[PDB]
Tab-separated table of C-alpha atoms and ligand atoms in Angstrom:
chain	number	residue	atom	x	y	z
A	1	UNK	CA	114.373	156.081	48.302
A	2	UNK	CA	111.053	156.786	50.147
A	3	UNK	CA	111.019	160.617	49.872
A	4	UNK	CA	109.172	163.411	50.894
A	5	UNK	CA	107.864	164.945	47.947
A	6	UNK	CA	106.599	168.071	47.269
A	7	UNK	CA	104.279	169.357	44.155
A	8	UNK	CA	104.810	173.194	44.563
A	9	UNK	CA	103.011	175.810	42.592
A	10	UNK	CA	105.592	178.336	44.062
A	11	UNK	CA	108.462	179.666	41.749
A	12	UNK	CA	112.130	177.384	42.113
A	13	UNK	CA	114.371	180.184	42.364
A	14	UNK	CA	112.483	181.831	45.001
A	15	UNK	CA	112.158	179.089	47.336
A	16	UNK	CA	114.204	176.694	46.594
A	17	UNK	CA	117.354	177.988	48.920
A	18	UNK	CA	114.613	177.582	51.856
A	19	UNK	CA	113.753	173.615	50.335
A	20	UNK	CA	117.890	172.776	50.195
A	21	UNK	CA	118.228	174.588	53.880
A	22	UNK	CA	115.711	172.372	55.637
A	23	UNK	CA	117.159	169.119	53.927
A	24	UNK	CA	120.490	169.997	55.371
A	25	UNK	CA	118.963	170.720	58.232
A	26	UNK	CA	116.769	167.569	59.316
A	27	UNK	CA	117.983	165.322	56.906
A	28	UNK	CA	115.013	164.497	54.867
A	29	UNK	CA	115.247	164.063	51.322
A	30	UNK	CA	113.162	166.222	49.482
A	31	UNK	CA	112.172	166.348	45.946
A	32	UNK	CA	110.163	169.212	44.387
A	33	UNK	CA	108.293	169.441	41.215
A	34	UNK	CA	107.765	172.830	39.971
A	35	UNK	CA	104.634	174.126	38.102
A	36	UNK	CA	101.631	175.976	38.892
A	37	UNK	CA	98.764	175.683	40.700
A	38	UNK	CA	96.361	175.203	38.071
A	39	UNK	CA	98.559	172.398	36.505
A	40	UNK	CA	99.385	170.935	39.771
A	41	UNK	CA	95.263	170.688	40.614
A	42	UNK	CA	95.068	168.766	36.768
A	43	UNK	CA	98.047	166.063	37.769
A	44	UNK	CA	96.474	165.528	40.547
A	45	UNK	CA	92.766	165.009	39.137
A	46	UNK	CA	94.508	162.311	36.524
A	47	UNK	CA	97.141	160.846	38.899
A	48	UNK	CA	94.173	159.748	41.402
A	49	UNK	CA	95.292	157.228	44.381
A	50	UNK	CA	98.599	156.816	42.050
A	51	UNK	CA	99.875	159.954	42.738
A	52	UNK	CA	103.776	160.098	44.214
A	53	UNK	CA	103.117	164.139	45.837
A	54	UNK	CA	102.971	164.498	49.474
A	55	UNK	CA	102.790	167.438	49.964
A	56	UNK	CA	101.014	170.894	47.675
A	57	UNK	CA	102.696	174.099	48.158
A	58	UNK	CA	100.268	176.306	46.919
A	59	UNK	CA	101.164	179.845	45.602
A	60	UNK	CA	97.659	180.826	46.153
A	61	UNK	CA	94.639	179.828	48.326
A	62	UNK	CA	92.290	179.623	45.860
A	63	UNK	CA	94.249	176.548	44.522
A	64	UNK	CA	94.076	175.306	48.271
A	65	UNK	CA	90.442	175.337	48.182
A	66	UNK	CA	89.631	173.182	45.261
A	67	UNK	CA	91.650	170.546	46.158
A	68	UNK	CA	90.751	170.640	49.609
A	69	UNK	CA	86.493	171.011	47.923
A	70	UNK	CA	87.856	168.169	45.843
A	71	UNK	CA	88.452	166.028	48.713
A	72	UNK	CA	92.240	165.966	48.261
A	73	UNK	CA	93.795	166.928	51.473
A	74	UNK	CA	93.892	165.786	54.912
A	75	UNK	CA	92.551	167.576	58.415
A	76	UNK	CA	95.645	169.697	60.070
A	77	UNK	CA	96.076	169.821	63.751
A	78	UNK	CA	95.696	172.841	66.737
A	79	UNK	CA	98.960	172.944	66.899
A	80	UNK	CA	99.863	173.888	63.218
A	81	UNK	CA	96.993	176.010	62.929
A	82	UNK	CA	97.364	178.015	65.657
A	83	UNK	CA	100.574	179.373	64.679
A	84	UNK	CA	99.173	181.797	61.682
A	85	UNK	CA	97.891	185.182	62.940
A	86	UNK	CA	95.252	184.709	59.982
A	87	UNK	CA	93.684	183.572	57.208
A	88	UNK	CA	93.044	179.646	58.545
A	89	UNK	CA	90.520	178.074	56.389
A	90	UNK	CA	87.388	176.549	58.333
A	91	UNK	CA	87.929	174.039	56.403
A	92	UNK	CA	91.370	173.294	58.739
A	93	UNK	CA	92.375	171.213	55.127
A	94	UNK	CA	95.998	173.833	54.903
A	95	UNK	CA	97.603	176.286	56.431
A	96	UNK	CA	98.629	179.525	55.176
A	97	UNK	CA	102.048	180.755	55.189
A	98	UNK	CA	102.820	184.358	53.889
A	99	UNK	CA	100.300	186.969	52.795
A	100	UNK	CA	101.054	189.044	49.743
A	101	UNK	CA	99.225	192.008	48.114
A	102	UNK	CA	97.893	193.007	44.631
A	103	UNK	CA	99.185	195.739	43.518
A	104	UNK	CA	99.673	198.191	40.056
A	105	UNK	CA	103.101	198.153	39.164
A	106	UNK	CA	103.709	201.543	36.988
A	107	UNK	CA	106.193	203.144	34.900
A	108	UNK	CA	106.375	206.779	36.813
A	109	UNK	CA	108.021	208.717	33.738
A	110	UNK	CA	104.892	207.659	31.707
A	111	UNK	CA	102.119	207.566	34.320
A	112	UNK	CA	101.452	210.201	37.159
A	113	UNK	CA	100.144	208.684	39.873
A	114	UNK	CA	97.040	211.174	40.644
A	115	UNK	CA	95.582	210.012	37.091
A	116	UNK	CA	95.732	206.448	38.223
A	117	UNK	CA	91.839	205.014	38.311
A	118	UNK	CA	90.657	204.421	42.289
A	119	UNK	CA	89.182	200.549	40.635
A	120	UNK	CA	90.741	197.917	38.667
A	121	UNK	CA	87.463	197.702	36.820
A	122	UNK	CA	88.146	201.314	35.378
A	123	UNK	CA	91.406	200.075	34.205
A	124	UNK	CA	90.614	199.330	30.567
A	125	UNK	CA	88.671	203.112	30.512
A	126	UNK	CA	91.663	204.574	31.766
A	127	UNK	CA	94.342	203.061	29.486
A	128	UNK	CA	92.200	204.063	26.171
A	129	UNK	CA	91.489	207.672	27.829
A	130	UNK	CA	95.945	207.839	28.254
A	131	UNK	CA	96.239	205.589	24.365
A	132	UNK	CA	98.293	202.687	26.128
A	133	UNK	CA	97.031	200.074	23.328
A	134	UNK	CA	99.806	197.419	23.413
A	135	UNK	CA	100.987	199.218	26.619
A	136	UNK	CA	99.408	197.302	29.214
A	137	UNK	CA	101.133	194.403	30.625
A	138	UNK	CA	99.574	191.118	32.544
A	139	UNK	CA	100.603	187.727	33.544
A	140	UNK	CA	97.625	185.342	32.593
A	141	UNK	CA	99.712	182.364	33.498
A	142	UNK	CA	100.167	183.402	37.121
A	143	UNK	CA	97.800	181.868	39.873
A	144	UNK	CA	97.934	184.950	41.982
A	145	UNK	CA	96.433	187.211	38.992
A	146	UNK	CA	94.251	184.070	38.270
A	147	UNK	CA	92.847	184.455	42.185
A	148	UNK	CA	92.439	188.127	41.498
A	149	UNK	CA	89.812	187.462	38.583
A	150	UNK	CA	88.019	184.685	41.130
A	151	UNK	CA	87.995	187.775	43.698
A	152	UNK	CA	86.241	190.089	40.885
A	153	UNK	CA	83.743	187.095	40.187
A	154	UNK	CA	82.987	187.187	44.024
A	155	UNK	CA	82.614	190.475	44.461
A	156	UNK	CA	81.186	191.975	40.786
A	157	UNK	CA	79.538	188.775	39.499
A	158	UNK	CA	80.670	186.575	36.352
A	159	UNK	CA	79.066	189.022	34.168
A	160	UNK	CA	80.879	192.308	35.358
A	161	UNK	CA	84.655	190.282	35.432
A	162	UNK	CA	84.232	188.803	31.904
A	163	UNK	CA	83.410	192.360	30.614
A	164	UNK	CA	86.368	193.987	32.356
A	165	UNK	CA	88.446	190.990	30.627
A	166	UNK	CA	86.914	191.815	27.425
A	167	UNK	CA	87.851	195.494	27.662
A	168	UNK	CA	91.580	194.627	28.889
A	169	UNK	CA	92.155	192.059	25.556
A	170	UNK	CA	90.816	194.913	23.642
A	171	UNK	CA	93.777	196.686	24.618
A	172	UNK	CA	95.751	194.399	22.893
A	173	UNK	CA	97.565	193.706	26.318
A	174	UNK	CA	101.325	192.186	26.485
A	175	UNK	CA	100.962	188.545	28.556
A	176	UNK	CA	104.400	188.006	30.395
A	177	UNK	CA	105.775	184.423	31.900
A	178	UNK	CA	106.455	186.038	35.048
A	179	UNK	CA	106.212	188.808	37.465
A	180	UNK	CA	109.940	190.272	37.168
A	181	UNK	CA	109.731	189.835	33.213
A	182	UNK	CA	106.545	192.043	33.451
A	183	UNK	CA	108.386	194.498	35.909
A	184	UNK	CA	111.909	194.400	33.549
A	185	UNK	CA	109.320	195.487	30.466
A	186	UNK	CA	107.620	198.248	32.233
A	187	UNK	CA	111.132	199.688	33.147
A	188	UNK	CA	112.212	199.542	29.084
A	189	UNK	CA	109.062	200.758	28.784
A	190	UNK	CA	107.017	198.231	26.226
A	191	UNK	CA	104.622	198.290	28.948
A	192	UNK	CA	103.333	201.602	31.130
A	193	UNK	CA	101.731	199.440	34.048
A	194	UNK	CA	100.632	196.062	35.102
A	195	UNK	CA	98.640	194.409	37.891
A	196	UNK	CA	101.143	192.087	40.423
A	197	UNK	CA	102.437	191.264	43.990
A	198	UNK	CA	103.842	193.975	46.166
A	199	UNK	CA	107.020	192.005	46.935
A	200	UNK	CA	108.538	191.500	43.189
A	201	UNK	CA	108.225	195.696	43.391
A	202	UNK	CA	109.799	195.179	47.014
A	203	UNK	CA	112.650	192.966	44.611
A	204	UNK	CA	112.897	195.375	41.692
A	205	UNK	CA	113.736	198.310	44.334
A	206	UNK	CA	116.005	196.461	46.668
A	207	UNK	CA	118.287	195.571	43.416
A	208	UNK	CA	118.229	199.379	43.156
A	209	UNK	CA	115.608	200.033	40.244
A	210	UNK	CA	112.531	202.731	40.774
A	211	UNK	CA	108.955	201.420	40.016
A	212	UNK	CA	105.590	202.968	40.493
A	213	UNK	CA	103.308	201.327	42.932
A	214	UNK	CA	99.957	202.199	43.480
A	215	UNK	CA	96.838	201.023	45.036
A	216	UNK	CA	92.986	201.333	44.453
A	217	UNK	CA	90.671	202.344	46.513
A	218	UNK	CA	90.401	200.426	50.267
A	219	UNK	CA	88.290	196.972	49.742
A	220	UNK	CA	88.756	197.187	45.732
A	221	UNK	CA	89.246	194.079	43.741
A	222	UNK	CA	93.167	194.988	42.228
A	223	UNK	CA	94.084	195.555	46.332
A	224	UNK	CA	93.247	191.726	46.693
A	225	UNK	CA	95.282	190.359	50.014
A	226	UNK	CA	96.438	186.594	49.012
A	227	UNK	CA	98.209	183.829	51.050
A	228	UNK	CA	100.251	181.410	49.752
A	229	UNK	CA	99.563	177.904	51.800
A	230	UNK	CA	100.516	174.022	51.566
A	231	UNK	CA	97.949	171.292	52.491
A	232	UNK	CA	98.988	167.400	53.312
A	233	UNK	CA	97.409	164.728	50.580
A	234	UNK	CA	95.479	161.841	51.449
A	235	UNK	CA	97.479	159.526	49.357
A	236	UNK	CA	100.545	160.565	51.052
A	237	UNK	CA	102.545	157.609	52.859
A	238	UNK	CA	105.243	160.237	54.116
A	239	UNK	CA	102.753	161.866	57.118
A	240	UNK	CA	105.324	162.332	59.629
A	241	UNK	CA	107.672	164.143	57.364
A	242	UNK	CA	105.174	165.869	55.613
A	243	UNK	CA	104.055	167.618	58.520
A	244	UNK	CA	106.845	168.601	59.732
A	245	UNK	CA	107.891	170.630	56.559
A	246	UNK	CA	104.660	172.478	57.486
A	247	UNK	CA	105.723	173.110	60.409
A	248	UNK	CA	109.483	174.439	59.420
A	249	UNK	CA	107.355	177.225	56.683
A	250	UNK	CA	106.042	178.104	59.723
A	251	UNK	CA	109.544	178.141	61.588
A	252	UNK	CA	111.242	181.953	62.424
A	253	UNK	CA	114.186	181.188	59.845
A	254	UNK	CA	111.719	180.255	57.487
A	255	UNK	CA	109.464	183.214	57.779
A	256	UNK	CA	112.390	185.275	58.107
A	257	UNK	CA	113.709	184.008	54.545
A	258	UNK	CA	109.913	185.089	53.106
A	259	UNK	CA	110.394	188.425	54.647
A	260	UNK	CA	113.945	189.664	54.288
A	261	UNK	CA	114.537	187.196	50.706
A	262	UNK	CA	111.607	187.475	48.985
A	263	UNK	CA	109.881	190.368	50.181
A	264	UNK	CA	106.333	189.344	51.157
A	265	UNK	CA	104.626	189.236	54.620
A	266	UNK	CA	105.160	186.851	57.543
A	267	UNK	CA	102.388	185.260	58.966
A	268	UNK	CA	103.463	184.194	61.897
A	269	UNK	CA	103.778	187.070	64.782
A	270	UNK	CA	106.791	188.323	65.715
A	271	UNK	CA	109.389	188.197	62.919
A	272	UNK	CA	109.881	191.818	61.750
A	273	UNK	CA	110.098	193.668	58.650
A	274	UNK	CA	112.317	196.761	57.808
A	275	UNK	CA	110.903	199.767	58.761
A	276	UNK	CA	110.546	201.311	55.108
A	277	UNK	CA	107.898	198.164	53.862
A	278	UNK	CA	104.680	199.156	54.084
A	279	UNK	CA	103.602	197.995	57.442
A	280	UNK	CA	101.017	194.459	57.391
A	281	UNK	CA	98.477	195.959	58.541
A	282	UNK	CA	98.139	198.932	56.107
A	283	UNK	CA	98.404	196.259	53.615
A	284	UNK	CA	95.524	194.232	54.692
A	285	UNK	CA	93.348	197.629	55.355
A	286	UNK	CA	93.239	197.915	51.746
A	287	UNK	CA	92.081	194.417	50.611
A	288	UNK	CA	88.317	193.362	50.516
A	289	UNK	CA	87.393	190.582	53.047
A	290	UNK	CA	86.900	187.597	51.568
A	291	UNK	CA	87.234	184.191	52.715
A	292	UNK	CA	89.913	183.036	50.606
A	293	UNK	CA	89.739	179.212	50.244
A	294	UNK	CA	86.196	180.072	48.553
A	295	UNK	CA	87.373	182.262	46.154
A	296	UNK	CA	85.859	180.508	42.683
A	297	UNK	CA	89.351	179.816	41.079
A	298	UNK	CA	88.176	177.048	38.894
A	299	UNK	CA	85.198	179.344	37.559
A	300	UNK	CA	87.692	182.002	36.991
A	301	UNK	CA	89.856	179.022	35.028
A	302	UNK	CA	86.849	178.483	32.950
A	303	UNK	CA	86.348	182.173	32.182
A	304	UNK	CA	89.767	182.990	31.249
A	305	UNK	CA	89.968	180.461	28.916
A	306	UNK	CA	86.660	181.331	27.814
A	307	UNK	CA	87.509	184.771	26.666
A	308	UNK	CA	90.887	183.613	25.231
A	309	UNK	CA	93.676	184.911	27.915
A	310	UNK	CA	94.178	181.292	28.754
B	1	FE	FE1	105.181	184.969	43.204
């Protein structure tokens, strides 16, 4: 009955083989709960010292950060943290896991890639210049789009991001549940292109469909380099077991699963990806540099509510 439990802002059907192969693996009992990020960060605001989670498996590192700025998590040792070739907060309150990669997902029979703007902010100019009103897809409910917007409020301003926002609902953009529904809808064509994480266009081309991907300009905003992470709560009476499920996402079957299963890159060195993947380090090239547990995802929250997306 006392069980290692686990509030993950991840998606189920990606990771839940990996969650059912370490329980039959080292015999702990583990019991996920499903959402996002955002809601995950509210349940745990309300559920105080009460809270039952031991564990937040973050699908961003935004996310991370506030609950580790809210005083939610606990320190992590060397040992963990010295695994990752990257991306360890200073904070030392989680450790990241895989690194994935904004990208714009395109329809190449309707867009040519050369017309393509070289900044996400030029976006919304771009898609009135080519008439895509109602053509434009995005996934408001998604915490790695939601990290995006707190990377263009860290590198534009407030101001600048809740303009571009403006000028994309002016579009009259389609909002989609998730990634692969965005992907499935450019690919039938009600939607030309859309802004989301190199590995669902990895997915969609692996199961044998073709899909536009294209990146802005080296250190834009829309080339945004994200980690997914899981930090350890302070309420948590399940430490020992706690820790080491951080310690198997770290493990070279787990990282293997992220790489060859769901597409996105390892973080640990070592464990290889096919030789037709953009390489990791290409990848990373193109991202700004930010340091990613500061990234103002509650701000970016409160603006995309604000202007009505959320
Ligand atoms: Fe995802």
């Amino acid at each position: 009955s006392p069980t290692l439990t686990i509030y993950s802002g991840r998606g189920q059907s990606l990771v839940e083989p990996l969650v059912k192969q370490f329980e039959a693996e080292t015999g702990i009992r583990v019991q996920v709960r499903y959402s996002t990020d955002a809601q995950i960060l509210a349940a745990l605001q309300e559920e105080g010292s009460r809270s039952p989670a031991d564990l937040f498996w973050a699908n961003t590192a935004g996310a991370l950060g506030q609950a580790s700025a809210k005083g939610l998590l606990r320190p992590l040792g060397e040992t963990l943290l010295e695994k990752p070739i990257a991306f360890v907060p200073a904070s030392r309150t989680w450790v990241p896991v895989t690194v994935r990669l904004r990208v714009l997902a395109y329809n190449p029979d309707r867009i040519k890639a050369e017309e393509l703007p070289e900044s996400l902010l030029d976006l919304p100019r771009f898609a009135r210049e080519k008439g895509l009103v109602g053509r434009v897809g995005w996934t408001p409910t998604y915490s790695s789009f939601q990290d995006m917007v707190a990377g263009m409020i860290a590198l534009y301003g407030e101001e600048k991001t809740r303009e571009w926002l403006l000028a994309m609902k002016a579009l009259a953009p389609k909002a989609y549940p998730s990634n692969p529904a965005m992907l499935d809808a450019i690919r039938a064509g009600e939607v030309d292109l859309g802004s989301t994480n190199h590995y669902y266009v990895v997915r969609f081309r692996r199961a044998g469909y073709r899909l536009g991907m294209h990146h802005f300009r080296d250190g834009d905003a829309g080339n945004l380099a994200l980690v997914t992470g899981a930090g350890l709560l302070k309420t948590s009476k399940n430490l020992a077991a706690a820790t080491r499920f951080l310690t198997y996402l770290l493990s070279p079957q787990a990282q293997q699963y992220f790489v060859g299963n769901i597409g996105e890159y390892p973080l640990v060195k070592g464990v290889a990806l096919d030789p037709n993947l953009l390489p990791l380090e290409e990848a990373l090239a193109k991202s700004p540099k930010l340091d990613l547990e500061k990234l103002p995802l509650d701000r970016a929250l409160r603006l995309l509510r604000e202007t009505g997306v959320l």
